[PDB]
RNA sequence: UUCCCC
RNA sequence: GGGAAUGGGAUUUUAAAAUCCC
RNA sequence: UUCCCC
RNA sequence: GGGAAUGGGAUUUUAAAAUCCC
C-alpha cells in the first residue's frame, strides 16, 4: 500500500484537516476532495484550536547526497573505529489519552553504564507551527516492562537530557576517538529517539581547534569536538551500525547468551546497550588476530612497547645467568628470534601457528596443562604474552590482566578484554589459578657494561659489578632510573610478571 | 492506530531534512544530487481567473498559475520542524500559495528559493510588474 | 528481451545501481539508461554501503569444452559406476527481511546416513567485491517443514561443512571407486548447494600418487584422490545424474513406495538421499543381470571365486559319494559344466528365465515351492546361488546373505543387496524361513586323490586315508589348511551353505 | 520477488566460470571452443573526445575506443566470485574502462588478457607508447 | 564449610512444594561412618551420612531454611536486590534468582556493621593465617620505622592502643 | 493465547 | 474438519472487583 | 501465517 | 503501541487462473 507510518497523524479527531492547513494530500478531509484535487468550500471554516500528535516512527536514513556523510557505515569501518563504539538502547512508552498510535522515548541507556529518563515529549501539529511539548503516555502493557512503571514520574526535560548525553559522550570518548559509533540492535526506535538529540549536515571543524566537529550548539550556531563541547546540546554527524542485520535469529538476549555469561538483566536500556556492544565485539573480534588492520596511536603505546621488550630482554638475561640451564623452551613467540642472542643456551621454539615465519624451526604445540605436563620437564620455559590454562613450575611468564581497563584495554566479551595497541587482541578473562606453580617476579636492574662517570643511587636492587664497591657511577645511576620507569610503565599498563619459586638475586651477585 | 499521511516516495528526503541543521540547504543539495522533489502536495481546482497574488485567503491563481494549499508547500510543515521565522509562525499555512505552471513539479523548492514583493503582493521575477 | 533467474538481485532496495557498479545493463538504474545505452550524470554519487544478495538458483551446466569433463552423465555410464553412487538431497531456508527471492542450503544429507546443518550463508554484492557471509533466513511455512525450525540454531560454518563433506566422501569411497556420482531427484537446488562445495576444471592427478584427482585444497592449490584428501575442502570434478529425468511423475516418495517398503521418513535430507539411490538402483538393476557389463576387481574377488569353486566341488563330490543319488538337478545353471565329471550320476540343467539360446539343451524352470515341490522328489537338487521362496528337503544350497554388507555388497532395493563381483547381481532379501527343511553344512574335508607325498594336523574333520593313523601327511595337512582358509573366506564373504537334514559324514568314512 | 540481472544467453558461460578453479583459464578455453563472449555489458553514450586512458572515473573514450562500466568488464564481478588479487578488491569496479573498438565485442576477455602501463595509464599495445 | 545446610528462599511456598521431592525430616541422627551430624539419607540402604560420606545418597536429611521476604520486604526480589547490588541480574533463571536471594540476605545481615559478639568455629588454617599476619605486620612496621625514622605513626582504624613494636622511637595516634 | 488430531 | 486448556495464594472494598506476591 | 521492537 | 514478510521453476488455458515439481 502507498502509505507509511512516518509523520502519521495520531490524533483522535474523526475528521481531516482543511486544504489550507493539511500538510499532505492524505491529510485533507474527505469533504474537500473532488476528482483527485481539492476544492475550496466557504461553508467549512478552518480549525484554529486543534492539536494533532505526529508520529516520528519510520525514518529511512538511506540518503545519497554529495557533500554529506552517511550515518550508517559498513562493518569494516566499524572494526576500524571500535574505539568509538557506544552501545545504545531505548525503552519507550505509549501515547494513550489524546492520541494513540506512536511511542515516545522514556529511558535511554548507553554501554558506558548510564540510564537517562526523559519526560514523554512529542511533536504536536498546531494551526501555526509544530510544537514540541509534553504528551500523555502510559507504560507498555507487559510484565517485562513493569520496572518502567515508576520511571513515568521520574523523567527530565529533554533540554537537560540531551545536554547530559553530550556531556557523557564527550567525557567518555575524548581520549579514545574523534567520533561516536552507535551499536544498535533494532534501529527503528533508536532512530526515533535520535531525532530528539542528533543533527546532521556537511562535515565541519571544531570552533576552537582543528579536530572533527562532533557536537553542535543551538544557542549559538557553533560546532565543537569532544574536548570543547561544554554547554553543547546536540550530537553532530554520528555513525551507527545495526547488529541484527548481520543474520541473527531470535531476540538480543538469546544471541548474547550463546557467547557471554557476565551480562544479563534484559529490558533495561543500559544493560541491553552493553549486551549489544558485547555481541558486536564477539562477532567482529573473537576469531583471530588480524594484522591487516592497523590502529592509530592515542597514548603511550610506544613507551609500553619499548618497555615490554626491555623487560623481556633483562629478565631472560638475568635468569639464564642465575642458574645456567643448558636448554630452554620458548613458547608462544610469533617469530623465531631469541630475546637474548648472546646467551650460550639451546633455544627450542614451539607455537600453535607462527605469524607466517619463513623459519619453520618452530614446532607445533597446541598447549594444555593436562596434556603437556611432561613436554618440558627440564629447562626453563618462556611464556611471554601466551594465554594457557596453567603454567608449569619452571616458567617465566608475562600475562596481561584483563581486569585493568584503560584507553588501550576496552571491555570485551565473556569477561575478556580488547587490547588495542597497534592491532586488536582479544584476551580471555584473567585467572589467578593459572599461577599456582609460580611467584611474582621482583624488580631488579642488571648490566655488565663498562661505565665511566641529583642524589647518587642508593638501592639494593641494582645488581651491577659497579655496585660491589661503595659507590655507583652516574651512567648506571641514569640507566637504573630508565629501567625503573620502564618496569613501572609495563606493570601499570596491566602486565603481570611471574617467575619460578627458586629464583633469587644472590646468584646474580655471583655472576661477577 | 492513527491515519497515515505520507507516501513512501517521500520517506528519504523527509527523513533527511528532519535531521539536518539547515533543512533549506539540505533540500537543495538533495535536489542537486539527483533526488526527486517532494510529492503528495494538495492542489486546488479553480477557474484560473484570480488576482494572481503569491499568498491569498482564497484560491486566486492567474491563467499561468496553479493554487496549492500553503501547508503543503512549506518545507518545515512537511518535515515538522522549527520555522526560522521571527516568532516561529508560518506565512504559507492558513493561506493559498500560487505556483507557476512550469514550476509546479517542485512547489516546495519554489517557495524555498523565491520571495514575494511586499508592495505588490506577488512573486518577484515571476509576474510582478513593478520592476 | 527475456531474462533469467540466475544471479537475480534479491535485495529490497527499490532503485538500481550506478553505471560504474552495475554488473550488467539490467542492473543500472533507469536514471542513466538512454537510447539503449547509459549516461554518466555528473552530480549523482555512487553508493558505498549497499549489500545486495545475489541468487545462486538457475545454473546450467550444459557447457562443451574440450579438456573439461561433463558433470551430468548418462545412465548407461552411471550403471558402470554404480559403486560410486552417493544419493544427495538438500533442504533449504528462505531469505527474509533484508532480501527476498532466493533459497539457501540448510541441511545436506547423503545416502551414507549423515546430515550436516549449515548456517544460512549467501553471496552479497558489495561496492568492493562479492562477500560470502551469513544472511537473514527463515524456515519455509508448512507443517512438514516444522522440524527444520530447530536447525536454524545449530548450523556450522561452511568452511567446516565442506571439510566434513570431503572427509565423509573419502572415507566412504576410497575402497570402492575413483570418483563420485551424485544421485539426485531435482538437480536445481542440488546445483545451487553444490556451488558451495564443488569445483570443476580439467582432469588432474593426485599430488602424492598417480590416481585421479577427486579433491582440491584452496589452502595449498593442490589436488588429491580419496586416499590423500586429508584436510582438503572442495570436491573436484564430480559426476551426477538426475533420476526424475528418467520419466518419473509425482514426488520421490510416491515413486519409491511402489517398489520398496524399507525406507521412509521424507523431508529429512539423508532419508530422501537413501530413497533416491534406492529408486535409481531399482530402475537400473532389479530388472535382470547384464552380463555384458564388467566391473574392475577392487579386492579379493578372485580369491572368493576360487574359494567358492573349491567348496562347491568338495561338497558336491562328498554328497554324491556318500548318498549315491541317481539324478542331480543343477537348477538355475544354464551351462552344462559338471563340477565333478566322473560322478556316476545323470545331470539335468535349467534356467530361471529364458536365455538367448533356443536349443533344447536346457529346460525352463521358474521354481516355487507352491508349484514345483513334488517335481523333484527323487535325487538331489543343487541350488547354487539360486533364490527361491522355499527349498525342498533334498537339496544342497549355497545362498548369499544380503545382510552382510561389504565392499563387494552394496545396499539394494526393498531389503535386497547389489553384489558386484565382475558383474552386478541384485539379490532379494535374506530370510531364514526358506531353509526349514535343511540344516547348516558342517565344515569338513574329504580326500579321494592318491596319498603319494609342518606341524602335524590334529583335527578329526579331515576325512582322508592318512587320518586313520598316527599323523596326517604334510600334503593333506597343508591342503586341509588351504581348504579351511577358503571356507572361512567364503563364509565371511556372506555365503551360507545348507544341506538336506539326512547328510552325515560317516558314510564317507566307509569309502576307504 | 527480486529484480533480474542477467539474460539467458549468458547462462552457460556464467555457470561454467562460477564453478571453475581458474575462471580466467576457463573463460579462455570456453572462447577457444567456439563459445560466445559474455554479453549484456554497460556501454556509455559519450562524445568520444576523451584522453583515451584505460581506467578513469569519467568516460574518457578516444575516437578509437568505447567506454564501459567497470563492473561489467570484470569476469569476477560478472560471475560473483573471488578476485585473485591479494586484497580481494576490484580495480575495475567503480570506474570506467575504455576498450578498443576493434575488441569491443568481448570487453570481459580484453580486460583479462591485457594490462595497463603504469607511467601513462594506457593499455599496453593499444595506445601506449613508451618504447 | 559447615555441618548443615540453610536454604535461603524468597517465597517458601513453591520452595516447600519442590522440597517434597528431595527432602526428608526426622529426629537428629549421626553419620554411619563417623560421629558427624547426619545431613543425607539413603533409601537404598536406610542409612544416614554427613557431607563427607554421602556418596550415592538420594535425600537431604534435616535441612534448615529462612524466608527473606518475611523480613519486611515489598515488591519482587529483583526490585529489592537492585537497591544495593549491581553485580547480579538475569531474573527468572533459577540459579540467578538464588544468587540474588542470598546476596540480599547477606546485605540485610552483614553490610551494616561487624558484630564482634558472634564468634565462628575454626574450620581451617585460621590461626596460622592470624599468626602470619601478626609476624608480617611486626616485621614490616619495625623495618619501616628503623629505615626511615618517621616522627609520628598514625595507626588509622585501630581502636586499641596496642603497639606492634613498643620500643620504637615514635609517637602513636589511634583512630576509629 | 496455546496445544493435540485429521 | 474435530477438540481441549489458560496455575497458586494473600489482602481490601463493595458473589464480584482491585491490589500485591509466586 | 510468522517474526522483531516497545 | 510500532513494524516487516510470506521461496524457486515448468506447463497449459483464457495479465490472470489452474496443474505439477522443488
Ligand atoms: Mg531493550
Ligand atoms: Mg528432500
Ligand atoms: Mg525464580
Ligand atoms: Zn576542539
Ligand atoms: Zn556479554
Ligand atoms: Zn657502572
Ligand atoms: Zn510552514
Ligand atoms: Zn512589486
Ligand atoms: Zn593419491
Ligand atoms: Zn528403498
Ligand atoms: Zn595323506
Ligand atoms: Zn571485479
Ligand atoms: Zn605506457
Ligand atoms: Zn561422616
Ligand atoms: Zn547481588
Short mmCIF file of N, CA and C and ligand atoms in Angstrom, two decimals, chain A residues 449 451 466 473 476, ligand 6:
data_model
loop_
_atom_site.label_atom_id
_atom_site.label_comp_id
_atom_site.label_asym_id
_atom_site.label_seq_id
_atom_site.Cartn_x
_atom_site.Cartn_y
_atom_site.Cartn_z
N UNK A 449 77.98 -3.78 31.41
CA UNK A 449 78.73 -2.88 30.55
C UNK A 449 79.73 -2.06 31.37
N UNK A 451 81.59 1.28 32.63
CA UNK A 451 80.98 2.56 32.94
C UNK A 451 82.05 3.58 33.29
N UNK A 466 79.66 -2.56 39.30
CA UNK A 466 79.99 -1.24 39.82
C UNK A 466 79.48 -1.08 41.24
N UNK A 473 78.45 4.54 39.55
CA UNK A 473 78.69 5.63 38.61
C UNK A 473 77.39 6.24 38.11
N UNK A 476 75.18 4.12 35.23
CA UNK A 476 74.21 3.18 35.78
C UNK A 476 73.17 3.89 36.64
ZN1 LIG J 6 78.59 1.35 36.12
#
